[model samples]
Target chain A: MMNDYLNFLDGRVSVRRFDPDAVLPNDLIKDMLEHASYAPSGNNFQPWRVVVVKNKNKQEDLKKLAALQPQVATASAVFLLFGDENAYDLTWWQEFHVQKGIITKDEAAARAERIRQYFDLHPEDKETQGLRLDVGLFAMNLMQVVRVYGYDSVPMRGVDFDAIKTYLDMPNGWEPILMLPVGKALQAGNPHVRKSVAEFAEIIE
Target chain B: GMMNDYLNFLDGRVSVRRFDPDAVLPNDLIKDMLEHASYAPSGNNFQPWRVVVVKNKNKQEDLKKLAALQPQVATASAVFLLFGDENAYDLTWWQEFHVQKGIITKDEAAARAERIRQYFDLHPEDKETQGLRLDVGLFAMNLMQVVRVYGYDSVPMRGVDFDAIKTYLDMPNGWEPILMLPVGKALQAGNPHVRKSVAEFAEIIE
Candidate 1:
């Protein structure tokens, strides 16, 4: 059973052409998003907000921001994943964790102070880099969950961030990091070409 | 059957902060997970990730201190330090990769290589680091899922002394450490999974 899952992992490819007419129900989309949110993050912050565009009009606007990739328009759904700069900020998270019993009042207070101090030491550029990294992890798991639910997806980073922010009427501190087009594949995906383990990784004994 | 099984595997994952003191992971399992992680997609298929496996006792001890005295860093069978190589799009690497895969002709590879070079040349340092770390994050997440599939557990961590870890590991130039994953059998089952609601995290634009 486990080995079959590994092949499923191996079989994932960057699907470009998706079935335009495919229909993904709201329940399924919600279930997949819930599963994807299981992805781990720095400090368990889960620093991302996802915008789902299934409306033809909204997708057209997204397509303009995404370089007019045909898949952007044709995919049954497009997910605009954004990173939140304040995911770990003390305001809500500390109280949330305390209420959840994941941390005590003392621990939450200490962690809140530590996070503030850390941010004070780091610049905006550094914080943005970390947020994007956390978002990437969440986005990857989302794509895989899409596939597990018998769908295909392409992870896209070629988007106009500023345009997306304006189009979504996004507030400050929220930045789109990756866009994914998801649905059934229009055809079998192209074969994957991955670098071998020796090519990209090394084990330091 | 497939959906249930997939969710079962995914839901089983948790941040394992405690591990058995005596269990040791076979090298083959670690190698297999790395191979699976290599399949993770990156921007332009740049595959900008590299990993360092720290198993040496002294090195693990140094990493433990660097990671805010996290005992899992030392107790886990092994720790995989994931790094993003900012220079992964170099001409030589791309040319060889594309040519071997037969994805593009040599001339095409050269043209694409030049375009990447110019893009990086024009982009800011923070943008480049963001892209690289994002790629590394994808690979790291995939690796962790693979660990779960193999019946092992992992904890992904980023709270560490980055400069100290780099100096201690003697990381290669152009490579920046992004996340550390400690993998092993758990001493106890992980805590319950709690997260913000989808309503809080997602919006449907219909």
Candidate 2:
């Protein structure tokens, strides 16, 4: 099982051709979302949101948005990962912790106040840096989760993002980062040409 | 493993701050982990992520200083400076690679390059695009996870002063520093990761 996972990580590749007839169970996808939501984030604000596309018409719309990438049309589902820049509320988060006995009511208030102060100090409106970084974590987990369920996926950025946002009628502060198309693979994608690890990683003592 | 087991795997990875002082990761292990990290997908297959790993001895002092004296930097076996190369996203750079490969015609390359140009046009002054960070984040997350596979732990850091560290490292022009990850064997078990309910993070477009 360990090897199954490690091998999956090592051997993961983007699959463009997916079995369109395949339909993922809703519960499976729900679990996938649960796993994806568990991904770490800066400030624990968890600024990631996902829009699941399952309807054929919506997938076609997404396919057009993603430069007519056939995968978007063929996949069982498409996950549009969005980063919500400033819509965080710690009220329930603090209360949840307090109820869990993770923190006292006073501690929860103190923590929430501290979080609010930080946000006030650093007001964010479509702040690209932190939002993308955190949501990117969520995106990876989604891809991996899909893989773990014996599905294949491709992370796409060659999309008309502005157009997609308009098509989806996304909120002002939400920015879509990656559109992942996941399904049973028609065939495995080969390894992409890559520069050696040494070219990218340097070890200095 | 069952679905539950997979969920546990996802949930169990924690950020370790205190690393074993004596535990040094083998170079092969680092390379293997990196090889997996490099598998992360990027937009149009443009992998923009770069890394510089700092190892044992006094260099940790330099890293520690750059990261606002984060103890993880001083103790971890290797500290990674992750970067996203702005040059990779340029229209000319895209043309140079595509046209030279003869994979597609110059016109097609230019057509593809035009998209990059438009992205740049949107954020003319801010070289770091949201797309770039999104891809790099995938790479960084993969690195963090694969580290756990190799029985190591890591922390993704952003507390460092990016410009100062870039200057300290004497990074070449056109590279945006994205993350600082310090990886090693853990000296102490870190806190369990907690998050808000899934309802807070996702919505199905039914």
Candidate 3:
């Protein structure tokens, strides 16, 4: 893939419809998700999970329940990026430190206790949004990487979450926020559209 | 400084607050901003965001009214309504190919899946708030970053009447207008704010 990521950013557009003939390799998908997983999390408690659905039958089922957005079934892959709210409150977060030998066997219980207390004291603030921003950056990086690798993607909001959850049998506290369909664009994404920056920038006191 | 200027382009992302009323932005630049915003991460890649641009003067006037008399609302050439689909967390993610790729066995996958389902069901309030906040924060950061790269300035505002704004804009159900990002040229410099010292907020948990 080309290293000049900025160029890709300048020209990138959402590819909602696919050519169908365009084949997206599993390895490439794996690489992008792996990189996405590396995104910074809150205190290494990476609570985010991504589900990629490529099967045609399942996609059709999801489309029916999700108000049948054509992009859901037409794209090569559908991604459900979610947040796991219980991750911080779980024991796995503390055990992770043990695997790294950051805590000893004798210290394990105390260490876990301390970590749990820390999360309690340090509740997530608006600034923790930085972690969420990282997720976007990860997506941007992956999109650019994918484009350079010769694939196109479309991020869409035209999804029905209520039915999707019931269809997918999602666990409690797992929230879905964004939906992206990836594939080769039947044609380049229509020209990008947005307001110029001047309308939004200001130095706040 | 046209094509190759993109290098200087990304580096010169100025936060534009003041704009030439007659100077209209092309569709291309606008698309770039939305695409850039798309890359920001959220809790699960469940991107709880949608950028609605209000170019119509009437809509701008309504937004201005709700914005607590901010001058830029009426003056700026373009405005973006920053919204998040609050229930984004409830979508079907396991059907996502990414989840299928993880864990080798259906049993392990099913186990993890059940755990995720239970976790969300238990903390609906926390899940929703954190997810939406996380989405907005990411959107805000990348929006700023993209503006800087595109050589424009932007002002993020929260001083608006949420109820009035929602009703006026006819926001879709579940979409919350957390803020408004009015984009234009800078009438003034946005020198970064004085931040608290690192030690003020950071404490090593020994």
Candidate 4:
């Protein structure tokens, strides 16, 4: 059973050409979104949001913003991934601790204060960098989950971020990280090669 | 046929903060995990990340100091320190990697190598640094997942003292440490995951 999962990983590829007529059910999309949210983040502060765009008009607008990457307009669904730079907040943590009965009110307050101090001490660059990495983890999981759902997807970062923020009407503090267009593949993706483990990693022991 | 369990598996992954100190992980197991980690995709197929496996007790103790004295750093079977080199996409490396695999001809490899070098030249340090970190994160997540698939546990940490760890590891100048993962059999199950609602994280545009 686990081998099947590994096969999916080995077979997964970044598909660019998609069959536009192949419509993905909303239910399946929802499942993938839920699965994507399961990706780990620093301090469990999942800082990403995904905007699922299926409207032909909106897809076309996104296509323009992405320098006309054909997948933006051709796929059945386009996911605009974003990260909230200011996702470290007290309310969510307090709610989590209280609802789960994981900690006392006083302890929760202390934990939240520590998180606040972390943000205050870190530079803006570090905050944005960490947010992007968290978002990347979400994106990688999403692409893998898309394949497991019998669909194909590709991640793109060549979009105009300012224009997309205006187009998507993104909320404040949210910054665009990457995008994925998920759909049935029109053609098999090109066979890609990977560096051997020996070449890519070293055992220092 | 098994999508349900597979989905459940992905959904069930969590950060394991504690490990069984008595557990002795075989070297082949780490190799198997790294093999799976190599399958993760990267920009331009330039797998820019490197994983350094730390198993020696003395080295682990040194790492513990750099990592805020986290017990997992010392207790786990191995601590994997991942880094990304700014010069990982050098012309020679790219040519050898792509050409030897028969993915591209010598001529094509030459052109692509120059293109990548020029692209790197044009980007600012901050942008390139962020790209490296993002790529490192992708690799780290894949490693953690592979560890789980092998019935092991892992916790990713970012609170380490970067300068100290780099010095302890004798890392090269251009290679920047990104994330550290402590891997072993779990001594304690992680806390139940608490996630925000899907509606809180995604928007649907009809």
Model 4 alpha-carbon drift over 4 Å, by segment:
A124-126, B105-127
Model 3: per-residue Cα lDDT at residue B117: 66
Model 2 over residues A1-205: C-alpha lDDT tens digits? 7665677676678898999899877788888888777677765668788788888888998888776889998889888888876546687667667876778999888878866765565443126677888888888888888777889888877677889989988897787777888899999888556556987788786
Count of backbone clashes, every candidate in sequence? 0, 0, 67, 0
The residue pairs found clashing in candidate 2 are: none
What candidate 1 gets wrong by more than 4 Å, as runs, is A122-126, B114-127
**What TM-score does chain B of candidate 1 reach?**
0.91
DockQ for model 3 equals: 0.05
* Chain A TM-score by candidate, in order: 0.92, 0.87, 0.76, 0.90
lDDT of 4 by residue, A1-205 (tens): 6676666666767899998888888888888988888888877778888889988788988899877889999899998888887676678778776787778989888888777776676554236678778888888888878877789988776567778888777886887777889999988887757767787566665
DockQ in order: 0.76, 0.60, 0.05, 0.64
Instruction: Compose the digit string of candidate 1's lDDT tens values, residues A67-91.
Output: 7888888888888888887676666
Where is the poorest 10-residue window by lDDT in model 3 chain A?
Answer: A196-205
lDDT of 1 by residue, B1-206 (tens): 88888777767778999888677788888889898988888877888888888766677888999989989998888899898887775668778988988899999988888766665665544236888778888888889888888878989887778788999878787887788898989988988778888998999776
**Chain B TM, every candidate:** 0.91, 0.84, 0.78, 0.90
How does candidate 4 fare on TM-score? 0.91
- Docking class of predicted structure 3: incorrect
Task: List the candidates ranked by DockQ, beginning with the highest.
Answer: 1, 4, 2, 3
Q: CAPRI verdict on model 2?
A: medium
* Candidate 3 off by > 4 Å: A1-3, A97-141, B1-206
Residue B188 deviation, candidate 1, in Å?
1.1
Candidate 1 scores a C-alpha RMSD against the true structure in Å of 2.0
Select the stronger candidate by TM-score from 2 and 3.
Answer: 2
